[PDB]
Scaffold this active site. Structure first.
Site: not given
Lengths: 163, 163
Positions: A53, A58-60, A63
């Site tokens: 998400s 971590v995902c931010d 990306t």
């Protein structure tokens, strides 16, 4: 077909896609709820960054890192997640970026099931990277063993740069 | 049974709940992915505000208004949506509304299916309001007939106030 998330076992649902395979098509939603498929990006190479998400740290960072470090006059960097389109649009606005492609798999898990990255227990996509050539051959794949860990950025970025 | 959303036809999936019914159980996720069920709110009256996505303007306003106008003395205001828990968490923080209860139906559509508010074509929950007394009898229901419109705030608030 087996990873961990936060230390706990997770079963991956869907078709296994391997390096050297022909990459499957799929149907996801852009931030305005238009349907998007691989055909929208025909003739370019693609770095497909898959995250649980974009509203997590971590995902931010993943990306942002892939969008900063990969070139985009040579190809396409796609972020696919189970976040709703509305969260992805808000995310782009809050980051202050207008050059970032985010796509949502929330409705059908079309992408996740076709690429084998559905965390069945969570209904979220497993952290993964797929690099497609301009002929949609899978040239590089990582499914991160522990979902809260980062992907190998340098290996994926190199595969993408070198085609 | 059928509504519109942006004027397009939408079919509602799930059990039909009417005023005078008692509230079905449900299993949803709080912002830290812990399970929440009806039993978590035993003893209180409830205003259940259902929104398609807290990251759209109408749903944002609906959440703010129900939380600011309803008394939290004897009862609680629940926001339920198919937003990911991480979007709900981030929304509350960003808005300075950390006290606000947001719950995610994203994994299983347990709430949506048990209350009859799944917009089948979109896999979002339909804009709706249910008011439950402390015995979990449904004293008031509105499913908004065109989902881009606001609910009837006054009627729901009056029903909740007079339990």
């Amino acid at each position: 077909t087996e990873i961990t998330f936060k230390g706990g076992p997770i079963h991956l649902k869907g078709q296994q896609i391997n390096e050297g395979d022909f990459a499957p098509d799929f149907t996801v939603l852009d931030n305005d709820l238009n349907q998007v498929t691989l055909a929208d990006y025909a003739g370019k190479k693609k770095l497909i960054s898959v995250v649980p998400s974009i509203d997590t740290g971590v995902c931010d960072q993943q990306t942002r890192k892939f969008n900063s470090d990969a070139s985009k006059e040579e190809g396409i960097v796609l972020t696919i997640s189970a976040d709703l389109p509305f969260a992805q649009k808000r995310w782009c606005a809050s980051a202050g970026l207008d050059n970032v492609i985010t796509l949502s798999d929330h409705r059908d898990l079309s992408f996740g099931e076709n690429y084998g990255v559905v965390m069945e227990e969570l209904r979220l996509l497993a952290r993964a990277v797929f690099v497609l050539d301009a002929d949609n051959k899978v040239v590089y794949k990582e499914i991160v063993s522990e979902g809260t860990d980062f992907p190998d950025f340098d290996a994926a970025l190199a595969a993408y740069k070198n085609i």
